[PDB]
């Protein structure tokens, strides 16, 4: 068979997220580090490169039994899952991390929210001379959702990695429920929460009855 499987999920923000964007020289008093927004709707967009590369750099610590000097040196548990540039059979690596374009806006404007991107203020104080240095950085608002989805494709090339990859990706989702996923994380941004990890086999003879009993 050929089994493409779609992982419907709800990225709900808490401690609202900022992904970087155009640090091309913006206006004077305006936002210094603006968020990347989808140019049709101007809602915040969490692109798939942040998700895939962040889950790459976080599953580095989990499933690379050896220390990895670079993402080419990922093991053959992650090279088949996130792609690899120098491996023989692990190019085109089976996971299309689709984006999310701020799914709810009829809900988030039903709550009395002016704009979906707050402009939180920040500065820095040097320890010597204590000079201030202010900045206005853009973030998405707190209780947003994000209709995020994966595409895992099973081409009968594996035939044994049915659940050898979902214990990896589900615990990566747990990592992202703990770690920040995007932007100035160590100041406490991002903090996505993954809700309703709904897998559905959009192509293939396959059941989720052995899948969502682990993915909860």
């Amino acid at each position: 068979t050929f089994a493409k499987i779609k992982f419907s999920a709800q990225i709900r923000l808490e401690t609202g997220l900022h992904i970087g964007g155009s640090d091309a020289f913006a206006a004077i008093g305006a936002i210094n580090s603006p968020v990347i927004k989808d140019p049709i709707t101007n809602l915040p967009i969490i692109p798939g490169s942040s998700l895939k590369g962040k889950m790459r750099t976080l599953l580095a610590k989990v499933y690379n039994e050896k220390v990895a000097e670079k993402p080419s040196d990922d093991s053959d548990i992650l090279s088949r899952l996130f792609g690899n540039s120098k491996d023989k059979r692990f190019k085109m690596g089976r996971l299309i991390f689709r984006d999310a374009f701020l799914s709810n806006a009829d809900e988030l404007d039903s709550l009395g929210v002016r704009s979906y991107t707050e402009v939180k203020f920040e500065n820095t104080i040097d320890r010597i001379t204590a000079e201030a240095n202010p900045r206005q950085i853009e973030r998405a608002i707190r209780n947003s959702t994000f209709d995020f989805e994966l595409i895992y494709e099973i081409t009968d090339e594996n035939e044994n990695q049915v659940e050898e990859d979902f214990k990896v990706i589900r615990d990566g989702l747990k990592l992202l429920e703990l770690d920040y996923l995007g932007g100035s994380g160590s100041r406490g941004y991002g903090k996505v929460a993954f809700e309703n990890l709904k897998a559905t086999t959009v192509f293939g003879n396959y059941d989720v009855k052995t899948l969502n009993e682990l993915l909860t």
Partner: protein, 121 residues
């Protein structure tokens, strides 16, 4: 008045035309108007100019007249900001807000005002 191309020179010689520290020549040719009496005005136009690219024009038109409230108000406190709005035709250009585009253009004019205000000393 303010178009798409002429406003930067307007803001330039609306910074030049402003009168400075003539008495008490301790670092003279310095403005009686303080920079914190300009940045407290431009912090309105910046929160318009970057929340204009998200929204409509016709959703912003509550804050747009509040700009004309606060420019009148801060012009009424110090004589320097009243001098500023006489040199720099701010309230006469707040009637010229008809869309998103001319609002962003006026905010670029306000940024040019603060830029050339910081430029001279």
């Amino acid at each position: 008045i303010l178009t798409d191309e002429n406003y930067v020179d307007i803001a330039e010689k609306a910074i030049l035309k402003l009168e400075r520290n003539t008495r008490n020549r301790k670092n003279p040719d310095a403005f009686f108007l303080t920079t914190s009496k300009l940045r407290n005005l431009l912090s309105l136009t910046s929160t318009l100019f970057d929340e204009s690219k998200v929204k409509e024009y016709d959703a912003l038109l509550d804050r747009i007249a509040y700009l004309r409230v606060q420019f009148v108000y801060q012009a009424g406190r110090e004589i320097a900001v009243k001098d500023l709005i006489e040199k720099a035709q701010i309230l006469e250009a707040l009637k010229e807000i008809k869309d998103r585009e001319t609002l962003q253009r006026f905010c670029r004019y306000m940024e040019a005002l603060v830029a050339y205000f910081k430029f001279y000393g």
